[PDB]
């Protein structure tokens, strides 16, 4: 009936001024636009249909055409920036906001979905959706005693749309919008649906990806313990954004970092640092490097949790980018740690895998590693045990690796090497 129409026929129906003809043609357009293989978004735009679809959003007496056109425009707005812009340019933003209050749940949901795609295009449309007043009516849809009474799909769409209002930078979302959304996000973060939890974590990860003040707005809401709980989830789609959020937080102050340690996050790292997903291991190791960049009592907690052997493990065998993060973790540890903590690192077997990575092609990791060796040596100096460390380094082939580094391109690389050699390996 409305299956496989030509764009020509859709236009003919939409221009008929018979509202039932328009309805059938709009549904035909929805069907074309919801096909998986190359929906003809550009042909529909070029046919001039967006203004008609937008006017149909306002037809309160014909809820079916509101739904069909909301679906058609949602799928156009799901495309390239230029496609989403065509939708915004036709006036869709206030028309979708008005539909948020529709008595028909399927129409309200579809308007939530369309605004999620518009806001998801980037900072400018995100902020334009906010200026048109989307937040108050979106939040009102979630103002129920128990989220479990909402249809599951509807709640997932609302959560996803809210996450796009939290997403993107340059600029980050307006501070007042973030403050307005946060109590609802905290509540969604405690909901029991895996997809709501994942998108709630994504939203929190965006809000903490920024300067310390943005992190504090989130940490002050008390969400860190729940994020640490979700870090432990079996679902990779939840662990991924929960870990990014935790990693973001520990880029903040020493005090923000302590909240993450206090909430028990370090106990999850034996698993994260051996996680079969490369991206999780790499993110977890980056996060460890920011914790070892912390205070001596925070380095002590990394020790107490048994995490130094795990760092030795990642240095010994991991994806190269993960080994690079491990190298930073070690350099930060040795830069901030006490001599006891540093000695401990050597006793855990850090020296050999550190030396092995000196054959890396990457120049930056060479610098980082040489920096750590220098720090370890300075610790050894204070103990009078410089010589023992020299032998350890020579025995595992490390001196050979360093001596050769005197013939490297980079200045800092050659300079740092010769300093090591002349000061410790006469």
């Amino acid at each position: 009936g409305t299956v496989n129409w030509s764009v020509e026929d859709i236009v003919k129906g939409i221009n008929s001024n018979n509202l039932e003809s328009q309805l059938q043609a709009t549904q035909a357009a929805r069907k074309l636009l919801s096909r998986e293989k190359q929906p003809p978004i550009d042909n529909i735009i070029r046919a001039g249909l967006i203004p008609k679809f937008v006017s149909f959003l306002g037809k309160t007496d014909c809820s079916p055409i509101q739904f069909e056109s909301a679906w058609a425009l949602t799928n156009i707005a799901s495309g390239t920036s230029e496609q989403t812009k065509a939708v915004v340019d036709g006036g869709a933003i206030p028309a979708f906001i008005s539909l948020l209050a529709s008595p028909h749940a399927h129409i309200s949901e579809q308007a939530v979905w369309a605004l999620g795609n518009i806001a998801g295009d980037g900072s400018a449309f995100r902020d334009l959706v906010i200026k048109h007043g989307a937040i108050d009516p979106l939040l009102a849809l979630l103002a129920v005693p128990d989220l479990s009474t909402l249809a599951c799909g509807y709640l997932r769409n609302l959560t996803w749309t809210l996450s796009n209002l939290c997403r993107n930078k340059n600029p980050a979302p307006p501070l007042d919008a973030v403050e307005q959304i946060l109590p609802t996000l905290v509540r969604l973060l405690h909901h029991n649906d895996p997809e709501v939890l994942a998108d709630s974590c994504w939203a929190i990860s965006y809000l903490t990806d920024g300067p310390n003040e943005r992190i504090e707005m989130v940490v002050k809401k008390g969400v860190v313990p729940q994020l640490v709980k979700l870090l432990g989830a079996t679902e990779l789609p939840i662990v991924t954004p929960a870990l990014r959020a935790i990693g973001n937080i520990v880029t903040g102050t020493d005090e923000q970092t302590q909240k993450v340690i206090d909430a028990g996050a370090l106990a999850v790292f034996p698993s994260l640092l051996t996680n079969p997903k490369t991206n999780i291991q790499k993110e977890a190791t980056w996060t460890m490097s920011n914790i070892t960049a912390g205070r001596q009592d925070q380095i002590q907690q990394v020790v107490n949790h048994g995490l130094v052997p795990f760092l030795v493990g990642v240095l010994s065998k991991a994806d190269f980018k993960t080994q690079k993060e491990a190298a930073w973790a070690i350099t930060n540890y040795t830069s901030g740690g006490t001599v006891e903590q540093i000695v401990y690192l050597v006793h855990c077997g850090i020296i050999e895998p550190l030396m092995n990575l000196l054959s890396a092609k990457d120049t930056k990791i060479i610098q980082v590693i040489l920096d750590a060796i220098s720090n370890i040596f300075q610790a050894a100096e204070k103990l009078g045990e410089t010589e023992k460390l020299s032998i350890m380094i020579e025995e595992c082939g490390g001196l050979d690796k360093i001596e050769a580094l005197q013939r490297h391109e980079n200045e800092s690389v050659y300079k740092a090497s010769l300093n090591l050699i002349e000061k410790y390996f006469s």
Partner: peptide, 10 residues
């Protein structure tokens, strides 16, 4: 993570 989502045909 995709920031846009199309609603697919049922």
């Amino acid at each position: 993570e995709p920031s846009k989502r199309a609603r697919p045909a049922e």
